[PDB]
Each structure stands twice: as C-alpha cells, then as structure tokens.
Amino acid sequence: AGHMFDVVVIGGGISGLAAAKLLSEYKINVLVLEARDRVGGRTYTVRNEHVKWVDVGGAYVGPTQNRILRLSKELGIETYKVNVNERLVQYVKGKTYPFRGAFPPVWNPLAYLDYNNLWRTMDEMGKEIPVDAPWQARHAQEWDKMTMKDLIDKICWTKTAREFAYLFVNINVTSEPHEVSALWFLWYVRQCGGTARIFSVTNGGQERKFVGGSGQVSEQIMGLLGDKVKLSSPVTYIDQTDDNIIVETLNHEHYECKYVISAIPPILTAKIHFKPELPPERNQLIQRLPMGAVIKCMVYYKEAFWKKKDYCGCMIIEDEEAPIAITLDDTKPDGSLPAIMGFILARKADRLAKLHKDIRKRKICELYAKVLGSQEALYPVHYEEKNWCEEQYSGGCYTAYFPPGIMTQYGRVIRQPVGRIYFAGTETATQWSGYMEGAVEAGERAAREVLNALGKVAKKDIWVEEPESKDVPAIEITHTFLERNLPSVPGLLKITGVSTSVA
Amino acid sequence: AGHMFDVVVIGGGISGLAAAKLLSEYKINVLVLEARDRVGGRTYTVRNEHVKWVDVGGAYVGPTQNRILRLSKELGIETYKVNVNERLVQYVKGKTYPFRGAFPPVWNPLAYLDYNNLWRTMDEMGKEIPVDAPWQARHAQEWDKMTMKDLIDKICWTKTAREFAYLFVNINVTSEPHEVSALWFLWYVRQCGGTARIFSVTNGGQERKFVGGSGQVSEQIMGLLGDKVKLSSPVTYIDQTDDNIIVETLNHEHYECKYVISAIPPILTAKIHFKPELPPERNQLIQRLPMGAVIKCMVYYKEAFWKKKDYCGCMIIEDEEAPIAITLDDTKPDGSLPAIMGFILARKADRLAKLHKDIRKRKICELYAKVLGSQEALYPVHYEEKNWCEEQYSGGCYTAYFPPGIMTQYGRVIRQPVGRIYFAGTETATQWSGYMEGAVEAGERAAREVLNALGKVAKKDIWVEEPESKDVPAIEITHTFLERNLPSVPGLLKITGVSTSVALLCFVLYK
C-alpha cells in the first residue's frame, strides 16, 4: 500500500529508473511512480509474433553516447550495427539518386558551396554556445529572437541547400524550422556533437540499436527494483510545505517523502498540481516547452528486396507530398523479418494522421516503391506504427523544443531545483539531451543532487564524467581541408569582386 | 455531497459562470468547480481599507464589448469613464512630450509616413483574416511562419515606427514581437476591431471600468447559483468512457455528469488527466498556447499631482530601462484615492520580478517622477501589485498567444469539442478573445452547444448576435483621407524616383 519513503521519483522512464537505480544502490528507500501500465515511456518495445520485438519509440545509440551504452551493458543488453553496406538514396524532385557517405552529395557548384557553408556555419555558431547553459552564449540574445528558418534563409543562397536545411531541422527536432528558436537548435546540435555526429549513421548516433529492444533497459532496471515501482499511478499532487513531502496520485494513493525527483517531460510537469505554487519562472517555463510531432513507422516485407539493387533501407526523401522524410533498414541482425523504418515528421505528422491506418500504410508503400524501384514495396506482410502525438503521458517524441525568445528568458531554469523537488528527464541533460543517453545523464545527475542533499555525496562528485565505452569507440570527426576553406556563395562573389552589378 | 449533475463546468471564471448561469436559466442541473478559494479568476478585485476596491486583474471594457456590458448591467454593475480630460504624455529617449489623441504624434516626415503605413497595413492584412477561423485566411500559411517581429521589420523602415510596433505588441499581448506569430497577432487585433479600437481609450476598449470592480461580475453571478459552485475544488480527472462522465477533483471529491464544459485556459487544460487520452491535435495543441507575462501595478498618492500639470494619468513610456510601458489614471470616480495604474510587460515582467517588492515600487516611482515632473511621484501612500506569472491556475494574463507555425497546424481546434467535452474560455471567443467580453462569448456559446446536445436549443440559435448596448454606443471609426492615402516610405521613394526622371527629363530636352 501507500507508505513513507526517502525519495519519490515521478517517472518510470529511463531517466526515472536510472535515478531510482543509483538511489537504491546507495541504500536509499526510493519509490517510483509511473503513470502508464508499463515502463520505458518514450522508449517502448512492442512484442507480437509478427515482429518478435520492435522499438516503436527510442531505439538508436552511438559513438559518444557512453552513459546509455554503459548502463545498457551492465543490464546485459547487446547492441547491433545498423545496416549500411548497400547504397543510400536521395529522392529529389525527379527520382532516386544512389550515393555513399554521410550526407547526400550535391553536384551544382553554387549549391555545393552554399550547402557546405551551411553545415560548417551551424557548427561554428554552435562552438560558441555553452552546452550546460545555452542562454549564456555571446550572441545569445540576438539569436534566440530568430527562428531557425530566419537563420536558415539568412545563410542559404541556394533554394536547394535551404530546403535541405529545413529537412535537417524536421528530422532532428520533429518540428518545422519556423517553429523553433535558432539559438536553441544550434545548441541541440552542438550538445550532441555537431551536425556530423547527430546525423551520421556510420559513426553517428544512428550507428546501432539494442538487440531485444531499447525498451528492455527500463524493463530490466525495473526488475532490480521490483516492489519499489508502482505502475498505473499518475502523480497528480505534490505538497511540500510540511516537514514531510506529500505526493498523491490519481489512484487515490498517498505517499510521503523527504525529497522528490521529477523524471518527466517539462511540459507534462503541468499534469501535476503543486502545493506552494511553483515560482513564476518555472511556472511560466513549464508552458513553453512543447513536444515535437512524429509517427514512427515500420513496414515489413518477406524479403529485403532493396538489397537486390545494392540499396540499404536508408532513404532521404525530399518532396513535399511524400509522407516519410527519412528511412532505415530495420531488418533483424539475423536477416530475420526484413523491414524498413521511416518517420513522418512535423507538418506531415498531423496531416497523415488524418488518414485511416490502411490508407496511410498504402501511401507509405507507394512511396517506398517509387523511391526504390521494385513494386515489391506495395506488398507488405505486416505494418507497425506509433503516433506519439496521441500519447497523454509523453506529449510527442524527440523531446521538447524551445520556441523563439524562450531560451533567453526562462531557459536558465530547466535543471534548477524548486525546493526539495529536483528535476530529471533527458530535456535537462547536457550531452545528448533528447536522446536516451541524455535521459541517463539527468536521471543520475538529479539523483546525486538529492544524495548530496542527504550528505552521502560531495557537491563535487555530483556531476560525473563518463568513461569512454571501449566497445563503441569515439572515433574523431574528419574535417576535410576543402570543407574547412571552400568559400560561401557570398564568399565566392567577394573573391570574384562581384557586388558592383545588376544580376 | 459530491453528487450527479447534468452539466459540470470546470472554471469559476467569467466565461465559466456565464455558461453556468445560462444553463441554470434553462433549468439545467449544472455544477461549477473552481480551483481557487475565490471566483473571477483572471478578473480579481482586491479589497482593503487602503484602496477600498481595485481591479488587480481584468478591468477595462468599451464600445463594442456589448456582451460583457449587457451581463454587467443585468447584474446591477455600473461603468465609469476613464479619465482623459488632461494631456497624455509620451516618454521617448529624451524626455516627456505632451499630446492629445489616439496614438502619440510623430513629427519626422519619414517616420510619420512609416508609422502611419504601419497601423494601416496591419489593419489591411487583418481584414483578410476570418475572425472565427484565422487559419482559413488566404495568405494564412505564409504569415504563420513569420514572427510578428519578422513582419514588423519587413514593413517598418524607421527605427522609430519599428520600436513602436514592438511596444504595441508588448502592450496588447504581454509578449515580445519575436515570440508570437504574425498571423495570430494580426488576427487578435482584427478580432478586437482593428488597431484603432484595441488601443484607443476615448472610444476604445480602455474607455471605462466597473464601479466596484470587474471582479464583482463573477462574485455576483455566483450568488445567483450559490449552492452549485464548489470552491477550492481543482478538477484533476475526467473519465468519459462510461454512460456517465466521471469527474474527480483534488479535494478527493467525485462527481458524475452527462456533459462537460471546460472554462479554463487552453494551457491549463493539461492540469487535467483525461480518460480517453485526448486526440493528438488537441493533446498537441494544449501544449503550445502559453500565457503572456504581466504585473499590474497601482501606485497611490494623496493627490493627483499630474492633474496640476494638465497631465492625466496616461503615459506611454518607450525606453528600454523603464519598468512600466503604459499607464492610466486609476483614481476613483469621486476623485477619491488618486492613483496611477501601470503595466510591466514581457521581458521586463520577469526582470523586475527579480527585485524586492519595495525596490520595484521605488523604481516605478522614480520613473513616474521623471516622466511627469514633480517629485511628488516619489512619495506614494499605498502600493498594490499583482504578478500573474505566479498564478498557478491562470498561467499569465492577457490570454494565451499563438507562436510561429502553430495557428496553421493545430489551431483549427481551440473551440472544437472532444466528445461530450465542450470548450469555453475567452481564448475560444471570436470577438474580443482575451478580454472579458471574449469570455462571455464563449461561456454562452459553449453553453448553447451543450443545450443543443440536449435538444433544448436549435443548431442555429447556438451562435447568437448581441444587441448593441444603448448605454455604450459603438461610435464608428473615422479614417482620415490623408491616412487612407499617404504613401509608405517605399511608396514615397517609388513616387519620387519618378519625379526625378520627370524633372530632369523635361528640363534637359529643353536645353
């Protein structure tokens, strides 16, 4: 039944459990309330005979995501490289264009320069931002007033390199470039390791998945806690005016504790009614950090027909109409159950959600067909999907995004405690915020904060550096001499003394 | 005790009660749950001996706000004109500049053109937007991707007319021009009756207040319901999968009903846990409609010293440092308790809130001093303030604002019902959304929707036009011939660029 504990953790997510774990290891009586009838939250592994196991939520891990990898291993969970042996393909206006490498290739000289200048510039601006304190950047104020679009259109002279920029935004933040803050975005990418890493599959965060499903990490870490993790128990009230903190749920349950760690998305923090009304700053901020929109879709075929054309599941579709933006081969390691994973992002997310499951499915197939070639794409065996906009206790999926003007006003708070209530959740991470590893950073960070508050941990050993995973080495990023110096579209015209004319 | 009712209304605000009222008048067993220990919500009249009565929240009403005026009167509440007999003043870079009229005057020719072009253009674009469906406008998609700043900087050539535009945004939406959607804003202003009305005091929505406090409207309409309005009962759960809708609060209470009307701010809708998880669209939208930031501040003096200089309380301060943006004479009708009402908006809101009450107060006085003149401004008798960012069950104050890209994606839902749950709240109004009158539009609209769902009201008589208040006539808006035609800064260059070809082409051929 409902009793008294030392620390009560709201959130059965990775970040939640991570904290719960660490806390138990310090022999602390911690309780963990989860609202869903399951655990893992934004990470969710669906199991049925048609697919065995599938990460319908969080799934990919990579090179610098040491924190998650470590915890993953400790829990006895394996990683498996994502298939990229074949060719990648870019679908632009006309048709499909095979290619190999990080980003697709651009052959128009001007575009090429603009395109390159883009990525390079975004990273240049990024270096100027404090990973742990975006709002502290030099040009911090000027930038946060600018929409990622504004910025993109201010540095892209090629309609090509520009639309591409947009997509990049869609793919990494599940939102439109005009919906988010340039300042924030620049940070998000930087906080992950620059454009290169955040996008690469061969050496990026999309390098590999978990054998058995990323979901397992939460499931596992729950078994180690067992008794101390109440499911279907949505926290709904936190009263911390007394010597003991009160915490009642929606099950009508009641629990008291000495400290609280919130391991749920900032925006969802509002599902809770706080006794001493939270401070303006927080109160105000908790209503400005929206969850992006995405529908993860896996289409299963009886055979990886794309391999027959030296094409790996990966496709980068740039075409208004098309439902999916990017895709990947989600076939199993043992070649079992070939399938293709694709994403429906931002604007498209809501648009396609207006259709019937079947129709949507079709649309997707019809697409994969044209992009690839063989109509073998029109005859799927099974189809699994997940629209995270529906989820009440998640809001959306690739974390929350900061809109224009918010980062530089109420941002300084995300991780700041509100008297005995500490904050976790990947949204408060510093490295890979938004990703699973990001969740861990926080889950633990918050945990240690509370431990320090109990005298068990020094104010120093609260923020701990992670040992580079020897199983997934952090191969440095090769930055070509050309890339480092090739002029920008404007740069080329300033070299060719071209600005004194009427084009 | 917690029983069964026909309709349960979440929200003891004006829009809430309005609905509750209308529903009772149709002999419907309706219940109204309010989270605060009081009623009126964003409208709140503070009472103490030092000020008798003061609207520390919503307060002004005007010419086209017929809905609120009507309900106000019916409840036996009077209105009193806002003082503007004296001179208004604009505080710019240098010092104070007296003036009379709607907007302050701009004397630099170019500025004047740009400045004028501004307002006119905002209204032109507005006319193109469907009051009841912003997202339906022609250039709807192009605009909603553009920040009100983006737009302002794209049509203002004068650093002057531009900074002014910003302020206008701050004052009307309690947010920064770069935080909100140009599309949305343009609508907000249009939905109120264009720039002219939304800002004017002499014939605008700031024409007059309620004698006794706007708060009274809710308080009153509560007495008519009495028993059927539970205070300190924050709704926390809504289960509507059964034949009867379940609704539990935070008091541990439980109520069942046939229909629900949500009369609370969109963003605050999330304080509730819904049984059948709301649809993506709504779910998604409910996390994108933030409440602006403002701190209403009244400073009381023993004498309206500003009247001694032919200055009425009104001041329009344009200067980064200065705490208050705009002010008004908040003295009482009978000259009793002279005082000045000022606002601390957007960025400034949070900044000043970091100070100690006393310090803030000082800063404000020090300002009023310089702006006006006499140091009599440094010796206040009493000071009352309210920072609405603090409020848990309100979020902020001049309603919610739509950020870039949201209106054209999830906007189409604000008023749309989610199975037996209908939506009220001023944020869903069509006329004066954000204002008290706006609240009423909705409160009733939603009410009728539910009545119609009960067969008591036709699908037609659901959206009812309001009879123009004969006590506060809707005087039309005079649009000068000059204003209607004077060229824009670009326009003047386009015209001159041709006066040049004409003068030099005519003369040269001659010699």
Ligand SMILES: *[C]C1=C([C])[C]=C2C(=[C]1)N([C][C]([O])[C]([O])[C]([O])[C]OP([O])(=O)OP([O])(=O)O[C][C]1O[C](N3[C]=NC4=C3N=[C]N=C4[N])[C]([O])[C]1[O])C1=NC(=O)[N]C(=O)C1=N2C#C[C]N([C])[C][C][C]OC1=[C][C]=C(Cl)[C]=C1Cl
């Ligand atoms: C959704 C999603 C998707 C779809 C995908 C993905 C994701 C997502 N991710 C992310 C993750 O998942 C996250 O971050 C995590 O999970 C987080 O965690 P946390 O922090 O812990 O949180 P959560 O989970 O949310 O949880 C919470 C919890 O709690 C609860 N609650 C609430 N409220 C409440 C509660 N309880 C009580 N009470 C109350 N009130 C809930 O319910 C829960 O449980 C990810 N991540 C990572 O790491 N990875 C991955 O993979 C992922 N995924 C993704 C990504 C993507 N990216 C970005 C992009 C991609 C790209 O791709 C590419 C590239 C290149 C080329 Cl060429 C191609 C392609 Cl395709």
Ligand SMILES: *[C]C1=C([C])[C]=C2C(=[C]1)N([C][C]([O])[C]([O])[C]([O])[C]OP([O])(=O)OP([O])(=O)O[C][C]1O[C](N3[C]=NC4=C3N=[C]N=C4[N])[C]([O])[C]1[O])C1=NC(=O)[N]C(=O)C1=N2C#C[C]N([C])[C][C][C]OC1=[C][C]=C(Cl)[C]=C1Cl
């Ligand atoms: C805050 C604010 C202020 C400060 C001011 C003002 C305002 C405000 N306003 C607004 C109003 O107030 C509003 O809109 C209303 O009130 C709304 O209503 P409704 O819709 O009903 O809502 P509410 O109230 O919020 O309520 C809700 C309720 O519910 C509850 N809850 C929540 N949640 C929950 C609950 N319960 C249970 N459960 C749950 N969950 C709450 O608590 C509540 O109770 C206004 N309006 C009008 O009409 N008027 C006025 O006056 C106002 N005010 C303002 C305005 C301003 N404007 C815009 C601008 C100004 C300008 O000025 C000038 C001009 C010219 C010259 Cl030369 C100078 C100057 Cl200074």
